[model samples]
Target: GVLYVGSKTKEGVVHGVATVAEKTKEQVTNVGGAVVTGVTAVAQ
Candidate 1:
């Protein structure tokens, strides 16, 4: 799952444990600003 996954509540209960904003910043921002933000969960 994702830790910082897009949610209306907040960034607490999730998966993964990190982020990747560059690719999404340019790849999507260059076209529609459709960037996917979230953290990587290290636990289960």
Candidate 2:
């Protein structure tokens, strides 16, 4: 299954969403801007 990882601001607003195979540290690092709070599994 794929996952949708969202990068959010400190105020809890999602600024971006990425379709990733897994939520890894490297993936998050490459995403850039803001911070990733959580990941949600999605149907692919």
Candidate 3:
């Protein structure tokens, strides 16, 4: 499954989670970013 997470800067450019400017904690280590996981079904 592909998940998309993003944020916009003051410039209003929305960056993906895979992007360096909006990288996850693990992603911040590498140059091209990292793969994020841990998606699970939860009871509502």
TM-score of each: 0.13, 0.16, 0.18
Please say which candidate is ahead in TM-score: 1 or 2.
2
lDDT of 1 by residue, 1-44 (tens): 34454558655665434445764545322222234565463543
Give the alpha-carbon lDDT of every model. Answer: 0.45, 0.52, 0.50
lDDT of 1: 0.45
lDDT string for model 3 (1-44, tens) is 57777655556653554443544455333343346576453542
Per residue, candidate 2 scores C-alpha lDDT tens digits across 3-43 of: 46656656765448656566556633343435455656364
Model 3 clashing residue pairs (backbone)? none
- The candidate scoring highest on TM-score is 3
Error of 3 at 18 (Å): 16
Task: Rank candidates by TM-score, best first.
Answer: 3, 2, 1
Determine the backbone clash count of candidate 2: 0
